[PDB]
Amino acid sequence: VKVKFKYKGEEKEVDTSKIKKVWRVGKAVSFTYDDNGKTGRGAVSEKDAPKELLDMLARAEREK
DNA sequence: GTAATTAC
DNA sequence: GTAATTAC
């Protein structure tokens, strides 16, 4: 599952297996991902997020 | 400006 | 401390 989005003017594609953290800001889904060493950031409208990313968010909200 | 949270 | 994300 690839999440596609634009950040700082660059179109990006990141596989959900590289996503490190996911959270909700307002009605947007924001996240960090591994980029071979550095950590990237991205965010999409909840309506453009693939179910797999939303599932990752829901699981995060339940974690102890 | 704030929201959540980060890289920078 | 700020810029970035979608949305208000």
Q: Is the CB of A46 under 7 A from strand C?
A: yes
Give the resolution in Å: 1.6
Nucleotides of C under 7 A from a protein CB: 4-8
Q: How many domains does chain A have?
A: 1
> What type of residue sits at position A12?
K
Among all protein residues, pick the one whose CA is nearest to the C1' atom of C4. A8
Enumerate residues 6+ apart whose C-beta is below 8 A from A23.
Answer: A29, A30, A31, A57, A60
Experimental approach: X-ray
What does the buried/exposed string (b/e) look like for A4-43 if buried means 16 or more CB atoms within 10 Å of the residue's CB? Answer: ebeeeeeebebebeebeebeeeeeebebebeeeeeebebb
CATH of the domain at A38: 2.40.50.40
Tell which residue, A52, A42, A36, has the closest CA to residue A13. Answer: A42
Give the tokens for residue A20.
């490190």
Question: What does residue A46 show for φ and ψ, rounded to 5 degrees?
Answer: -55, -30
The boundaries of the domain holding residue A15 are 1-64
The residues pairing with A11 across neighbouring beta strands, listed in sequence order, are A6
Distance in angstroms: CA A7, C1' C3: 11
Q: Is the CB of A6 under 7 A from strand C?
A: yes
